[PDB]
Amino acid sequence: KTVGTKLVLTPQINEGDSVLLTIEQEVSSVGKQATGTDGLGPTFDTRTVKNAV
Amino acid sequence: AQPDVMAELEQVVAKLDIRRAQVLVEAIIVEIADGDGLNLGVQWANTNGGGT
């Protein structure tokens, strides 16, 4: 799984000025590369926002 | 399509390509929590008489 600063964006242009941006982004992390979990695999701190604007 | 349909599709497209409006949505989640436990209790033990 690719967890880091991700921007996935498909822009679409209004003939004149204003951009339609389909954004799926997040800032995510595996906590500490020397720390475990109460579960079973790695966990991730994510800040995500997927929207069209 | 036929030039008749081209002009009809041209109105459909023009209506369907309208600048879709944007919405800023703020949610506000407020929670407040507390409570009071109290444990007071008195025990008397007497060798001669008895204990509680």
Side-chain angles (χ1 to χ4, degrees):
Chain A
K1 309 291 180 166
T2 39
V3 304
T5 299
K6 303 207 296 196
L7 184 56
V8 176
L9 172 65
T10 186
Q12 157 186 347
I13 282 153
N14 169 25
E15 179 70 11
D17 239 29
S18 60
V19 212
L20 181 59
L21 296 164
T22 307
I23 307 103
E24 180 178 2
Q25 79 165 27
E26 58 182 335
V27 180
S28 65
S29 33
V30 59
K32 291 184 172 178
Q33 294 286 156
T35 321
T37 328
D38 33 33
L40 233 7
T43 52
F44 290 98
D45 273 0
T46 62
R47 292 174 300 169
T48 301
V49 51
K50 185 178 66 67
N51 62 346
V53 297
Chain B
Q2 295 74 358
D4 172 24
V5 180
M6 201 46 97
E8 196 168 5
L9 285 171
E10 163 181 0
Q11 288 175 331
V12 173
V13 163
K15 284 176 200 152
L16 203 46
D17 185 73
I18 58 147
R19 152 161 209 192
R20 296 206 289 293
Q22 299 167 342
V23 180
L24 169 63
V25 178
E26 295 98 350
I28 298 98
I29 298 96
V30 286
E31 183 282 334
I32 293 178
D34 62 343
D36 64 338
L38 170 153
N39 45 25
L40 73 83
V42 179
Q43 342 186 359
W44 304 348
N46 185 337
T47 64
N48 267 21
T52 316

Coordinates of all heavy atoms in Angstrom, one line a residue:
Chain A
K1 N 0.9 -1.2 0.0 CA 0.0 0.0 0.0 C 0.9 1.2 0.0 O 1.8 1.3 0.9 CB -0.9 0.0 1.2 CG -1.7 -1.3 1.4 CD -2.7 -1.5 0.4 CE -3.6 -2.7 0.5 NZ -4.8 -2.7 -0.3
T2 N 0.7 2.2 -0.9 CA 1.4 3.5 -1.0 C 0.8 4.5 0.0 O -0.3 5.0 -0.3 CB 1.5 4.0 -2.4 OG1 0.2 3.7 -3.0 CG2 2.6 3.4 -3.2
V3 N 1.4 4.6 1.2 CA 1.0 5.6 2.2 C 2.1 6.6 2.4 O 3.2 6.3 2.7 CB 0.7 4.9 3.5 CG1 -0.4 3.8 3.4 CG2 1.9 4.3 4.2
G4 N 1.8 7.9 2.1 CA 2.7 9.1 2.2 C 1.9 10.3 1.8 O 0.7 10.2 1.9
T5 N 2.6 11.4 1.4 CA 1.8 12.5 0.8 C 1.4 12.1 -0.6 O 2.3 11.9 -1.4 CB 2.6 13.8 0.9 OG1 2.8 14.1 2.3 CG2 1.9 15.0 0.3
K6 N 0.1 11.8 -0.8 CA -0.4 11.5 -2.1 C -1.4 12.6 -2.6 O -2.2 13.1 -1.8 CB -1.2 10.2 -2.1 CG -0.4 9.0 -1.6 CD -0.9 7.7 -2.2 CE -2.3 7.3 -1.8 NZ -2.6 5.9 -2.0
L7 N -1.2 12.9 -3.8 CA -2.2 13.6 -4.6 C -2.5 12.8 -5.8 O -1.6 12.5 -6.5 CB -1.6 15.0 -4.9 CG -2.6 16.0 -5.6 CD1 -3.8 16.2 -4.7 CD2 -1.9 17.3 -5.9
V8 N -3.8 12.4 -5.9 CA -4.2 11.8 -7.2 C -5.2 12.8 -7.8 O -6.2 13.1 -7.2 CB -4.9 10.5 -7.0 CG1 -5.4 10.0 -8.4 CG2 -3.9 9.5 -6.4
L9 N -4.9 13.3 -8.9 CA -5.8 14.4 -9.4 C -6.0 14.2 -10.9 O -5.0 13.9 -11.6 CB -5.2 15.7 -9.0 CG -5.9 16.9 -9.6 CD1 -7.4 17.1 -9.1 CD2 -5.1 18.2 -9.4
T10 N -7.3 14.3 -11.3 CA -7.7 14.4 -12.8 C -8.3 15.7 -13.0 O -9.5 15.9 -12.7 CB -8.6 13.2 -13.1 OG1 -8.8 13.3 -14.5 CG2 -9.9 13.2 -12.4
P11 N -7.6 16.8 -13.3 CA -8.2 18.0 -13.7 C -9.0 18.0 -15.0 O -8.7 17.2 -15.9 CB -7.0 18.9 -13.9 CG -6.0 18.4 -12.8 CD -6.1 16.9 -13.1
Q12 N -9.9 18.9 -15.1 CA -10.8 19.1 -16.3 C -11.1 20.6 -16.5 O -11.4 21.3 -15.5 CB -12.1 18.3 -16.1 CG -13.3 18.7 -16.9 CD -14.5 18.0 -16.5 OE1 -14.5 17.0 -15.9 NE2 -15.7 18.5 -16.9
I13 N -10.9 21.1 -17.7 CA -10.8 22.6 -17.9 C -12.1 23.2 -18.5 O -12.5 22.7 -19.5 CB -9.5 23.0 -18.7 CG1 -8.3 22.9 -17.7 CG2 -9.7 24.4 -19.3 CD1 -7.1 22.6 -18.5
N14 N -12.7 24.1 -17.8 CA -13.7 25.1 -18.4 C -13.0 25.9 -19.5 O -12.0 26.4 -19.2 CB -14.4 25.9 -17.3 CG -15.2 27.1 -17.8 OD1 -15.8 27.0 -18.9 ND2 -15.4 28.1 -17.0
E15 N -13.6 25.9 -20.7 CA -13.0 26.6 -21.9 C -12.2 27.8 -21.5 O -11.1 28.0 -22.1 CB -14.2 27.1 -22.8 CG -13.8 27.8 -24.0 CD -13.0 27.1 -25.1 OE1 -13.0 25.8 -25.0 OE2 -12.5 27.7 -26.0
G16 N -12.7 28.6 -20.5 CA -12.1 29.9 -20.1 C -11.1 30.0 -19.0 O -10.0 30.3 -19.2
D17 N -11.6 29.7 -17.7 CA -10.7 29.9 -16.5 C -10.8 28.7 -15.6 O -9.7 28.1 -15.3 CB -11.2 31.1 -15.8 CG -10.1 32.2 -15.6 OD1 -9.3 32.3 -16.5 OD2 -10.2 32.9 -14.6
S18 N -12.0 28.4 -15.1 CA -12.2 27.6 -13.8 C -12.0 26.1 -14.0 O -12.7 25.5 -14.9 CB -13.5 28.0 -13.2 OG -14.6 27.7 -14.0
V19 N -11.1 25.6 -13.2 CA -10.8 24.1 -13.2 C -11.7 23.3 -12.4 O -11.8 23.6 -11.2 CB -9.3 23.9 -12.8 CG1 -8.7 22.7 -13.5 CG2 -8.5 25.1 -12.9
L20 N -12.3 22.2 -12.9 CA -12.9 21.1 -12.2 C -11.8 20.2 -11.8 O -11.2 19.6 -12.7 CB -14.0 20.4 -13.0 CG -14.7 19.3 -12.3 CD1 -15.4 19.8 -11.1 CD2 -15.7 18.6 -13.2
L21 N -11.6 20.0 -10.5 CA -10.5 19.1 -10.0 C -11.1 17.9 -9.2 O -11.8 18.2 -8.2 CB -9.7 19.9 -9.0 CG -9.0 21.1 -9.6 CD1 -8.5 22.1 -8.5 CD2 -7.8 20.6 -10.4
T22 N -11.0 16.7 -9.8 CA -11.4 15.5 -9.0 C -10.2 15.1 -8.2 O -9.2 14.6 -8.7 CB -11.8 14.4 -9.9 OG1 -12.8 14.9 -10.8 CG2 -12.3 13.2 -9.1
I23 N -10.3 15.3 -6.9 CA -9.1 15.1 -5.9 C -9.4 13.9 -5.1 O -10.5 13.7 -4.6 CB -8.9 16.3 -5.0 CG1 -8.7 17.6 -5.9 CG2 -7.7 16.1 -4.2 CD1 -9.9 18.5 -5.9
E24 N -8.5 13.0 -5.0 CA -8.4 12.0 -3.9 C -7.0 12.1 -3.3 O -6.0 11.8 -4.0 CB -8.6 10.6 -4.5 CG -8.6 9.5 -3.5 CD -8.9 8.1 -4.1 OE1 -9.1 8.0 -5.3 OE2 -8.9 7.1 -3.3
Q25 N -6.9 12.7 -2.1 CA -5.6 12.9 -1.4 C -5.7 12.5 0.0 O -6.8 12.4 0.6 CB -5.2 14.3 -1.5 CG -5.9 15.2 -0.5 CD -5.1 16.5 -0.4 OE1 -4.5 17.0 -1.3 NE2 -5.3 17.1 0.8
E26 N -4.5 12.3 0.6 CA -4.4 12.0 2.0 C -3.0 12.2 2.5 O -2.1 12.2 1.6 CB -5.0 10.6 2.3 CG -4.3 9.5 1.6 CD -4.9 8.2 1.9 OE1 -5.5 8.0 3.0 OE2 -4.8 7.2 1.0
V27 N -2.8 12.5 3.7 CA -1.5 12.4 4.4 C -1.6 11.3 5.4 O -2.3 11.5 6.4 CB -1.1 13.8 5.0 CG1 0.3 13.7 5.7 CG2 -1.2 14.9 4.0
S28 N -0.9 10.2 5.1 CA -1.1 9.0 5.9 C 0.3 8.5 6.3 O 1.3 8.8 5.7 CB -1.9 8.0 5.2 OG -1.3 7.6 4.1
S29 N 0.3 7.7 7.4 CA 1.6 7.2 8.0 C 1.4 5.9 8.7 O 0.2 5.6 9.1 CB 2.1 8.3 8.9 OG 1.0 9.0 9.5
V30 N 2.4 5.2 8.9 CA 2.4 3.9 9.6 C 2.8 4.1 11.1 O 3.6 3.3 11.6 CB 3.3 2.9 8.9 CG1 4.8 3.4 8.8 CG2 3.3 1.5 9.5
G31 N 2.3 5.1 11.7 CA 2.7 5.6 13.1 C 4.2 5.6 13.2 O 4.8 6.5 12.6
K32 N 4.8 4.6 13.9 CA 6.3 4.5 14.1 C 6.8 3.2 13.4 O 6.3 2.1 13.8 CB 6.7 4.5 15.6 CG 6.5 5.8 16.3 CD 6.9 5.7 17.8 CE 6.9 7.0 18.6 NZ 7.4 6.8 20.0
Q33 N 7.9 3.3 12.6 CA 8.5 2.1 11.9 C 9.1 1.1 12.9 O 9.8 0.1 12.5 CB 9.6 2.6 11.0 CG 9.1 3.4 9.8 CD 8.4 2.5 8.7 OE1 7.6 3.0 7.9 NE2 8.8 1.3 8.6
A34 N 9.0 1.4 14.2 CA 9.6 0.6 15.3 C 8.5 0.3 16.4 O 8.9 -0.1 17.5 CB 10.8 1.2 15.9
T35 N 7.2 0.6 16.1 CA 6.0 0.5 17.0 C 5.0 -0.5 16.4 O 4.8 -0.5 15.2 CB 5.4 1.9 17.2 OG1 6.4 2.9 17.3 CG2 4.5 1.9 18.4
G36 N 4.3 -1.2 17.3 CA 3.3 -2.2 16.9 C 1.9 -1.6 16.8 O 1.8 -0.4 16.7
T37 N 0.9 -2.5 16.9 CA -0.5 -2.2 16.9 C -1.3 -3.0 17.9 O -0.7 -4.1 18.3 CB -1.0 -2.4 15.4 OG1 0.0 -2.1 14.4 CG2 -2.2 -1.5 15.1
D38 N -2.5 -2.7 18.3 CA -3.3 -3.6 19.2 C -4.0 -4.7 18.3 O -4.4 -5.7 18.8 CB -4.4 -2.9 20.0 CG -5.0 -1.7 19.3 OD1 -5.1 -1.7 18.1 OD2 -5.3 -0.7 20.1
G39 N -4.0 -4.4 17.0 CA -4.5 -5.4 16.0 C -3.4 -6.3 15.4 O -2.6 -6.9 16.3
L40 N -3.2 -6.4 14.1 CA -2.5 -7.5 13.5 C -1.5 -7.0 12.4 O -0.4 -7.5 12.5 CB -3.5 -8.6 13.0 CG -3.3 -10.0 13.5 CD1 -2.2 -10.1 14.5 CD2 -4.6 -10.6 14.0
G41 N -2.0 -6.2 11.5 CA -1.1 -5.6 10.5 C -0.6 -4.2 10.9 O -0.8 -3.8 12.1
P42 N 0.0 -3.4 10.0 CA 0.3 -2.0 10.3 C -1.0 -1.1 10.3 O -1.9 -1.5 9.6 CB 1.1 -1.6 9.1 CG 0.6 -2.5 8.0 CD 0.4 -3.8 8.7
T43 N -1.0 0.0 11.0 CA -2.1 1.0 11.0 C -1.6 2.3 10.3 O -0.4 2.5 10.3 CB -2.6 1.3 12.4 OG1 -1.5 1.7 13.2 CG2 -3.3 0.1 13.0
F44 N -2.6 3.1 10.0 CA -2.2 4.4 9.3 C -2.9 5.6 9.8 O -4.2 5.5 9.9 CB -2.6 4.2 7.8 CG -1.6 3.2 7.1 CD1 -2.0 1.9 7.0 CD2 -0.3 3.6 6.8 CE1 -1.2 1.0 6.4 CE2 0.5 2.7 6.3 CZ 0.1 1.4 6.0
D45 N -2.2 6.6 10.1 CA -2.8 8.0 10.3 C -3.0 8.7 9.0 O -1.9 9.0 8.4 CB -2.0 8.7 11.4 CG -2.5 8.4 12.8 OD1 -3.5 7.6 12.9 OD2 -2.0 9.0 13.8
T46 N -4.2 8.9 8.6 CA -4.5 9.4 7.3 C -5.3 10.7 7.5 O -6.1 10.8 8.4 CB -5.3 8.4 6.5 OG1 -6.5 8.2 7.2 CG2 -4.5 7.1 6.3
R47 N -5.0 11.7 6.6 CA -5.9 12.8 6.4 C -6.2 12.9 4.9 O -5.3 13.1 4.1 CB -5.2 14.1 6.9 CG -5.1 14.0 8.4 CD -4.3 15.2 8.9 NE -3.0 15.2 8.4 CZ -2.1 16.2 8.5 NH1 -2.5 17.3 9.1 NH2 -0.9 16.1 7.9
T48 N -7.5 12.7 4.6 CA -7.9 12.3 3.3 C -9.0 13.3 2.9 O -9.7 13.8 3.7 CB -8.5 10.9 3.3 OG1 -7.5 10.0 3.7 CG2 -9.1 10.6 1.9
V49 N -9.1 13.5 1.6 CA -10.3 14.3 1.1 C -10.3 13.9 -0.3 O -9.3 14.0 -1.0 CB -10.0 15.8 1.4 CG1 -8.7 16.2 0.8 CG2 -11.2 16.6 0.8
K50 N -11.4 13.3 -0.7 CA -11.7 13.0 -2.1 C -13.0 13.7 -2.5 O -14.0 13.4 -1.9 CB -11.8 11.5 -2.4 CG -12.0 11.1 -3.8 CD -12.1 9.6 -4.0 CE -13.3 8.9 -3.4 NZ -14.5 9.4 -4.1
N51 N -12.9 14.6 -3.4 CA -14.0 15.4 -3.8 C -13.7 16.0 -5.2 O -12.5 16.0 -5.6 CB -14.3 16.6 -2.9 CG -13.2 17.5 -2.8 OD1 -12.1 17.2 -3.2 ND2 -13.4 18.7 -2.2
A52 N -14.8 16.3 -5.9 CA -14.6 17.2 -7.1 C -15.0 18.6 -6.5 O -15.9 18.8 -5.7 CB -15.5 16.8 -8.2
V53 N -14.1 19.6 -7.0 CA -14.3 21.0 -6.7 C -14.1 21.7 -8.0 O -13.3 21.2 -8.8 CB -13.2 21.4 -5.6 CG1 -13.4 20.7 -4.3 CG2 -11.8 21.2 -6.2
Chain B
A1 N -25.4 12.9 -35.7 CA -26.9 12.8 -36.0 C -27.3 13.8 -37.1 O -26.4 14.6 -37.5 CB -27.6 13.0 -34.7
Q2 N -28.6 13.7 -37.5 CA -29.1 14.7 -38.5 C -28.9 16.1 -37.9 O -28.9 16.3 -36.7 CB -30.6 14.4 -38.7 CG -31.0 13.1 -39.4 CD -30.8 12.0 -38.4 OE1 -30.5 12.1 -37.2 NE2 -31.1 10.8 -38.9
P3 N -28.9 17.1 -38.8 CA -28.7 18.4 -38.4 C -29.9 18.9 -37.5 O -29.6 19.7 -36.6 CB -28.6 19.2 -39.7 CG -29.3 18.3 -40.7 CD -28.9 16.9 -40.3
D4 N -31.0 18.3 -37.7 CA -32.2 18.5 -36.8 C -31.9 18.0 -35.3 O -32.3 18.7 -34.4 CB -33.5 17.8 -37.2 CG -34.6 17.8 -36.3 OD1 -34.7 18.8 -35.5 OD2 -35.5 16.9 -36.3
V5 N -31.2 16.9 -35.2 CA -30.9 16.3 -33.9 C -29.7 17.0 -33.4 O -29.6 17.1 -32.1 CB -30.7 14.8 -34.0 CG1 -30.3 14.2 -32.7 CG2 -31.9 14.1 -34.6
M6 N -28.8 17.4 -34.2 CA -27.5 18.2 -33.9 C -27.9 19.4 -33.1 O -27.3 19.7 -32.0 CB -26.7 18.6 -35.1 CG -25.2 18.8 -34.8 SD -24.5 17.5 -33.7 CE -23.7 16.5 -34.9
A7 N -28.9 20.1 -33.6 CA -29.4 21.4 -32.9 C -30.2 21.0 -31.6 O -30.1 21.8 -30.7 CB -30.3 22.1 -33.9
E8 N -30.8 19.8 -31.6 CA -31.5 19.4 -30.4 C -30.5 18.9 -29.3 O -30.7 19.2 -28.1 CB -32.5 18.2 -30.7 CG -33.5 18.0 -29.6 CD -34.7 17.1 -30.0 OE1 -34.7 16.6 -31.2 OE2 -35.6 16.9 -29.2
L9 N -29.5 18.2 -29.8 CA -28.4 17.7 -28.9 C -27.6 18.9 -28.4 O -27.1 18.8 -27.2 CB -27.5 16.7 -29.6 CG -28.1 15.4 -29.9 CD1 -27.2 14.5 -30.9 CD2 -28.3 14.6 -28.6
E10 N -27.6 20.0 -29.2 CA -26.8 21.2 -28.8 C -27.5 21.9 -27.7 O -26.8 22.5 -26.9 CB -26.6 22.1 -30.1 CG -26.2 23.5 -29.8 CD -26.0 24.4 -31.0 OE1 -26.2 23.9 -32.1 OE2 -25.7 25.6 -30.8
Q11 N -28.8 21.8 -27.5 CA -29.5 22.5 -26.4 C -29.4 21.6 -25.2 O -29.3 22.1 -24.0 CB -31.0 22.7 -26.7 CG -31.3 23.8 -27.7 CD -32.8 23.8 -28.1 OE1 -33.5 22.9 -28.0 NE2 -33.2 25.0 -28.4
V12 N -29.5 20.3 -25.4 CA -29.3 19.2 -24.3 C -28.0 19.5 -23.6 O -27.9 19.5 -22.4 CB -29.5 17.8 -24.8 CG1 -29.2 16.8 -23.7 CG2 -30.8 17.6 -25.4
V13 N -27.0 19.5 -24.4 CA -25.6 19.7 -24.0 C -25.4 21.0 -23.2 O -24.9 21.0 -22.1 CB -24.6 19.6 -25.2 CG1 -23.2 20.1 -25.0 CG2 -24.6 18.2 -25.8
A14 N -25.9 22.1 -23.8 CA -25.8 23.4 -23.2 C -26.5 23.4 -21.8 O -25.9 24.1 -20.9 CB -26.4 24.5 -24.1
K15 N -27.6 22.7 -21.7 CA -28.3 22.7 -20.4 C -27.5 21.8 -19.4 O -27.5 22.1 -18.2 CB -29.7 22.2 -20.5 CG -30.7 23.2 -21.1 CD -32.0 22.5 -21.3 CE -32.9 23.3 -22.3 NZ -33.9 22.4 -23.0
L16 N -26.9 20.8 -19.9 CA -26.3 19.6 -19.2 C -24.9 20.0 -18.8 O -24.4 19.3 -17.9 CB -26.4 18.4 -20.1 CG -26.4 17.1 -19.4 CD1 -27.4 17.0 -18.3 CD2 -26.7 16.0 -20.5
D17 N -24.3 21.0 -19.4 CA -23.0 21.5 -19.1 C -23.0 22.8 -18.3 O -21.9 23.4 -18.2 CB -22.2 21.7 -20.5 CG -20.7 22.0 -20.3 OD1 -20.0 21.1 -19.9 OD2 -20.4 23.2 -20.5
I18 N -24.1 23.1 -17.6 CA -24.2 24.3 -16.8 C -23.2 24.2 -15.6 O -23.1 23.1 -15.0 CB -25.6 24.4 -16.2 CG1 -26.1 23.1 -15.5 CG2 -26.6 24.7 -17.4 CD1 -27.0 23.4 -14.3
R19 N -22.5 25.3 -15.3 CA -21.6 25.4 -14.2 C -22.3 24.9 -12.9 O -23.1 25.6 -12.3 CB -21.0 26.8 -14.0 CG -20.6 27.1 -12.6 CD -19.7 28.3 -12.5 NE -18.8 28.2 -11.3 CZ -18.0 29.2 -10.9 NH1 -18.0 30.4 -11.4 NH2 -17.2 29.0 -9.8
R20 N -21.9 23.6 -12.5 CA -22.5 23.0 -11.2 C -22.0 23.8 -10.0 O -20.7 24.0 -9.9 CB -22.1 21.5 -11.2 CG -22.7 20.7 -12.3 CD -22.8 19.2 -11.9 NE -21.5 18.5 -11.7 CZ -20.7 18.3 -12.8 NH1 -21.1 18.7 -14.0 NH2 -19.6 17.6 -12.5
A21 N -22.9 24.2 -9.2 CA -22.6 25.1 -8.0 C -21.9 24.2 -6.9 O -22.1 23.0 -6.8 CB -23.8 25.7 -7.5
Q22 N -21.1 24.9 -6.1 CA -20.3 24.3 -5.1 C -20.9 24.6 -3.7 O -21.5 25.7 -3.5 CB -18.9 24.9 -5.1 CG -18.1 24.7 -6.4 CD -16.9 25.5 -6.5 OE1 -16.8 26.5 -5.8 NE2 -16.0 25.2 -7.4
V23 N -20.7 23.7 -2.8 CA -21.3 23.8 -1.4 C -20.2 23.7 -0.4 O -19.5 22.6 -0.4 CB -22.4 22.8 -1.2 CG1 -23.0 23.0 0.2 CG2 -23.5 22.9 -2.2
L24 N -20.0 24.6 0.5 CA -19.2 24.5 1.7 C -20.1 24.0 2.9 O -21.0 24.7 3.3 CB -18.6 25.8 2.1 CG -17.9 25.8 3.5 CD1 -16.8 24.9 3.5 CD2 -17.5 27.2 3.9
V25 N -19.7 22.8 3.4 CA -20.6 22.1 4.4 C -19.7 22.0 5.7 O -18.8 21.2 5.7 CB -21.0 20.7 4.0 CG1 -21.8 20.0 5.0 CG2 -21.8 20.8 2.7
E26 N -20.1 22.8 6.7 CA -19.5 22.7 8.1 C -20.4 21.9 8.9 O -21.6 22.2 9.0 CB -19.3 24.1 8.7 CG -18.2 24.9 8.1 CD -18.8 26.0 7.1 OE1 -20.0 25.9 6.9 OE2 -18.1 26.9 6.7
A27 N -19.9 20.8 9.5 CA -20.6 20.1 10.6 C -20.0 20.5 11.9 O -18.8 20.9 11.9 CB -20.4 18.6 10.4
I28 N -20.8 20.5 12.9 CA -20.3 20.8 14.3 C -20.8 19.7 15.2 O -22.0 19.5 15.4 CB -20.8 22.2 14.7 CG1 -20.3 23.3 13.8 CG2 -20.5 22.5 16.1 CD1 -21.3 23.7 12.7
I29 N -19.8 18.9 15.7 CA -20.1 17.8 16.7 C -19.6 18.3 18.0 O -18.4 18.4 18.2 CB -19.4 16.5 16.3 CG1 -20.0 16.1 14.9 CG2 -19.5 15.5 17.3 CD1 -19.1 16.5 13.7
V30 N -20.6 18.5 18.9 CA -20.2 19.0 20.3 C -20.7 17.9 21.2 O -21.9 17.5 21.1 CB -20.9 20.3 20.6 CG1 -20.1 21.4 19.9 CG2 -22.3 20.4 20.3
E31 N -19.8 17.4 22.1 CA -20.2 16.4 23.1 C -19.7 16.9 24.4 O -18.6 17.5 24.5 CB -19.7 15.0 22.8 CG -20.1 14.0 23.9 CD -19.3 14.1 25.2 OE1 -18.2 14.6 25.1 OE2 -19.9 13.7 26.2
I32 N -20.4 16.7 25.5 CA -20.0 17.0 26.9 C -20.4 15.9 27.8 O -21.5 15.4 27.7 CB -20.6 18.3 27.3 CG1 -20.1 19.5 26.5 CG2 -20.5 18.5 28.8 CD1 -20.7 20.8 26.8
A33 N -19.5 15.5 28.7 CA -19.5 14.3 29.5 C -18.9 14.6 30.9 O -18.0 15.4 31.0 CB -18.8 13.1 28.8
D34 N -19.4 13.9 31.9 CA -19.0 14.0 33.3 C -19.8 13.0 34.1 O -20.6 12.3 33.6 CB -19.2 15.4 33.9 CG -20.6 15.8 33.9 OD1 -21.4 15.2 33.2 OD2 -20.9 16.8 34.7
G35 N -19.6 13.0 35.4 CA -20.4 12.2 36.4 C -19.7 12.1 37.7 O -18.5 12.3 37.7
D36 N -20.5 11.7 38.7 CA -19.8 11.6 40.1 C -20.2 10.3 40.7 O -21.4 10.0 41.0 CB -20.2 12.9 40.9 CG -21.7 13.0 41.2 OD1 -22.5 12.4 40.5 OD2 -22.0 13.6 42.2
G37 N -19.1 9.5 40.9 CA -19.1 8.4 41.8 C -18.8 8.9 43.2 O -18.2 9.9 43.4
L38 N -19.2 8.1 44.2 CA -19.1 8.4 45.6 C -19.0 7.0 46.3 O -19.9 6.2 46.0 CB -20.4 9.1 46.0 CG -20.6 9.4 47.5 CD1 -21.5 10.6 47.8 CD2 -21.3 8.2 48.2
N39 N -18.0 6.6 47.0 CA -18.0 5.4 47.8 C -17.6 5.7 49.2 O -16.4 5.9 49.4 CB -17.4 4.2 47.2 CG -16.0 4.4 46.6 OD1 -15.3 5.4 47.0 ND2 -15.6 3.6 45.6
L40 N -18.5 5.8 50.1 CA -18.2 6.0 51.5 C -19.0 4.9 52.3 O -20.1 4.6 52.0 CB -18.6 7.4 51.9 CG -20.1 7.6 52.0 CD1 -20.7 7.2 53.4 CD2 -20.4 9.1 51.8
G41 N -18.3 4.3 53.3 CA -18.6 3.0 53.9 C -17.8 2.9 55.2 O -16.6 3.3 55.2
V42 N -18.4 2.4 56.3 CA -17.8 2.4 57.6 C -17.9 1.0 58.1 O -19.0 0.4 58.1 CB -18.4 3.5 58.5 CG1 -17.7 3.5 59.8 CG2 -18.3 4.9 57.8
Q43 N -16.7 0.4 58.6 CA -16.7 -1.0 59.1 C -16.1 -0.9 60.5 O -15.2 -0.2 60.8 CB -15.8 -1.8 58.2 CG -15.5 -1.2 56.8 CD -14.8 -2.2 55.9 OE1 -14.4 -3.3 56.3 NE2 -14.5 -1.7 54.7
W44 N -16.8 -1.6 61.4 CA -16.4 -1.7 62.9 C -16.1 -3.1 63.2 O -17.1 -3.9 63.0 CB -17.6 -1.2 63.7 CG -18.0 0.2 63.3 CD1 -17.3 1.1 62.5 CD2 -19.2 0.9 63.8 NE1 -18.0 2.3 62.4 CE2 -19.1 2.2 63.2 CE3 -20.2 0.6 64.6 CZ2 -20.1 3.2 63.4 CZ3 -21.2 1.5 64.8 CH2 -21.2 2.8 64.2
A45 N -14.9 -3.5 63.6 CA -14.6 -4.9 64.0 C -14.2 -4.9 65.5 O -13.3 -4.1 65.9 CB -13.5 -5.4 63.1
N46 N -14.9 -5.7 66.3 CA -14.6 -5.8 67.8 C -14.3 -7.3 68.1 O -15.1 -8.2 67.8 CB -15.7 -5.3 68.6 CG -15.4 -5.3 70.1 OD1 -14.6 -6.0 70.5 ND2 -16.1 -4.4 70.8
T47 N -13.1 -7.5 68.7 CA -12.7 -8.9 69.1 C -13.8 -9.6 69.9 O -14.3 -10.7 69.6 CB -11.3 -8.9 69.7 OG1 -11.4 -8.2 70.9 CG2 -10.3 -8.2 68.8
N48 N -14.3 -8.8 70.9 CA -15.3 -9.4 71.9 C -16.7 -9.6 71.3 O -17.2 -10.7 71.5 CB -15.3 -8.6 73.2 CG -14.3 -9.0 74.2 OD1 -13.4 -9.7 73.9 ND2 -14.5 -8.7 75.5
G49 N -17.2 -8.6 70.6 CA -18.6 -8.4 70.3 C -18.9 -8.9 68.9 O -19.9 -9.6 68.7
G50 N -18.1 -8.5 67.9 CA -18.4 -8.9 66.4 C -17.8 -7.8 65.5 O -17.5 -6.7 65.9
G51 N -17.8 -8.2 64.2 CA -17.2 -7.3 63.1 C -18.2 -7.2 61.9 O -19.0 -8.1 61.8
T52 N -18.1 -6.1 61.2 CA -19.0 -5.8 60.0 C -18.1 -5.5 58.8 O -17.6 -4.4 58.7 CB -20.0 -4.6 60.4 OG1 -20.5 -4.8 61.7 CG2 -21.1 -4.5 59.4

